[PDB]
Assembly symmetry: C3
């Protein structure tokens, strides 16, 4: 609970960001008069909608990776990346909402942040498994010698 | 294990609920003959589909908050909120499926439950970080006095 | 911290798999020239898109279940199901990409693996709660007897 509080903070922040995104769709729904069963309408609504939707489907990836990296590599490092990602995503949502062009730059930023997290989580897992593995590997070569 | 079992239960219940929503869409797909690559068709299907999709995208928000709140504030209180949310969501799904008007009321219900969870997670996190911060704050203004 | 390392590993693998599906959509987006605000186009694109979207919405269900089962029943068993599921999903994505028919077989495979995990998680939670409940139940029926 001590070594997880930073993670949980970034997590809650992320949830708030997602809640913001979905509030913006609800607003763009009134603004551009697009009725609830409808997913489609004026391009400015559609861009806002699609941004929220792209952000929503990546969220679980962010969460999973945040925690895995935070626990197996470094809480502080993971939390910082999470922050960078979350911020990049806000920029993505806003760029996309303007033009389908202005989402590209922030998307790449967020992709890097997320890849970094994946990289950390990967090392942290290797650091965990590789020693135990190499030990069991060498034990195989020692049983032969004796 | 003992301090998270109630959370895990509500989590599993939520998973089941989502599984239900999913099965309903598969049903309404046969019922209204809407073939797999198509996301669109009769209003009856689209409402069912969109309800599941709305429920699906909030689910990680619910999970994230449920656990952060459960762990940092109170397992029982979080778990009870989760239950309230999950029920409200079931109502939302069924209301929406009838008319895009009948989803509104339960949506608000679910939004409240989810916001409360966010609030609890927020308090719990403040309670964790605040004293240690006030300690360091006093240490500063105490450097002055001494 | 390490009675969860296998879980964390299957989790990260899952994230990578989703990262893969997302990249595949990005690719099919250029390949069939479908501009970003648009969700719709040639059936070849739509199938790839829909696959990624179906995979993405079940992902949180997978994660939630994987961890709850892994923690309350057995880490190795959960992780193995996770692996089966993940692989089944890869096959789903690929089949769906070719034809909306070739998705069905792997979908069922994935559905089994996922239900199995739900089953394990359910038992594990029963094993935790059910002793105490049946005991209180017998006590009640025993208070009557004596
Ligand atoms: C942290 C969790 C919170 C996540 C965010 C979810 C918050 C939920 C709050 C619900 C607010 C929605 O508010 C509601 O929106 C719907 C569409 O979206 C509007 O639309 C509604 O009224 C219009 C009238 O113009 C009808 O034509 C339409 O069929 C009906 O759906 C309502 O006028 C508005 O009252
Ligand atoms: C919703 C509010 C979000 C607040 C999120 C908090 C961000 C905190 C990031 C911490 C910065 C990381 O810095 C790390 O800190 C830990 C704390 O012991 C130590 C490490 O040596 C250091 O590298
Ligand atoms: C470099 C390769 C050397 C291999 C030796 C590693 C020994 O592996 C050690 O196993 C014990 C189990 O009792 C635990 C430690 O966390 C782990 O590091
Ligand atoms: C510990 C609790 C376990 C909960 C696990 C969660 C799994 C979810 C399963 C709950 C199913 C909900 O139960 C649902 O009730 C409604 C009643 O309005 C029924 O509603 C049905 O009949 C009515 C007519 O009476 C129709 O208007 C409606 O279109 C139709 O769906 C559904 O047939 C049933 O599926
Ligand atoms: C910094 C601390 C973070 C923890 C916050 C915990 C909040 C718990 C209290 C729950 C009440 C929140 O209630 C919610 O408030 C926000 C205010 O931004 C409203 O949101 C409204 O303002 C924002 C401006 O930022 C608009 O983008 C949005 O379109 C609009 O609807 C929601 O319509 C309302 O439902
Ligand atoms: C302006 C008015 C604002 C009002 C705000 C009110 C503050 C709300 C904060 C409540 C959250 C406190 O979070 C509290 O954390 C402690 C951690 O020590 C938990 O305590 C738990 O773990 C500790 C170990 O440290 C055990 O000793 C204890 O048996 C157990 O219950 C409490 O279950 C939880 O209630
Ligand atoms: C929680 C998991 C929910 C996953 C949702 C996916 C549902 C898949 C639809 C199942 C329909 C049953 O389809 C049938 O399955 C059985 C056993 O599985 C086999 C048959 O060849 C197949 O025709
Ligand atoms: C707490 C509940 C846990 C149940 C555990 C059972 C797991 C074994 C799998 C069988 C579940 C049967 O679930 C059934 O699936 C088929 C095919 O997908 C459809 C039905 O609508 C659904 O009711
Ligand atoms: C998958 C099936 C799971 C069903 C679980 C059913 C839940 C049963 C409710 C049990 C509630 C007990 O709540 C208990 O409260 C006491 C208060 O002194 C404390 C314990 O940590 C907590 O476990
Ligand atoms: C009853 C159904 C059988 C499923 C039980 C499986 C869970 O078995 C669990 O093992 C772990 C590992 O030491 C411990 C738990 O206390 C125990 O409940
Ligand atoms: N769901 C995404 C998968 C790939 C992706 O994240 N694409 C990025 C870069 S093209 C995007 O901005 N998607 C636009 C959107 O989803 O609306 C999609 O359909 O495009
Ligand atoms: N994805 C949602 C984001 C905002 C939201 O959650 N909207 C609520 C209130 S308008 C809703 O019931 N959406 C209808 C739907 O998603 O089909 C949407 O497109 O509407
Ligand atoms: N979101 C799903 C919910 C139900 C589901 O998972 N359907 C399966 C079996 S029909 C599927 O492969 N859906 C195709 C898709 O989502 O593109 C849908 O709309 O179909």
């Amino acid at each position: 609970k001590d070594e997880v509080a930073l993670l949980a903070a970034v997590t809650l922040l992320g949830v708030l960001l997602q809640a913001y995104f979905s509030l913006q769709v609800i607003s763009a729904r009134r603004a551009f008069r697009v009725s609830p069963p409808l997913t489609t309408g004026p391009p400015e609504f559609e861009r806002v909608y699609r941004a929220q939707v792209n952000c929503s489907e990546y969220f679980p990836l962010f969460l999973a990776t945040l925690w895995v990296a935070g626990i197996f590599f470094h809480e502080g490092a993971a939390a910082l990346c999470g922050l960078v990602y979350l911020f990049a995503r806000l920029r993505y949502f806003q760029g996309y909402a303007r033009s389908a062009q202005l989402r590209l730059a922030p998307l790449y930023a967020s992709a890097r942040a997320l890849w970094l997290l994946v990289a950390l989580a990967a090392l942290g897992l290797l650091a965990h498994f590789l020693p135990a593995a190499l030990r069991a590997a060498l034990l195989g070569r020692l049983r032969t010698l004796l």
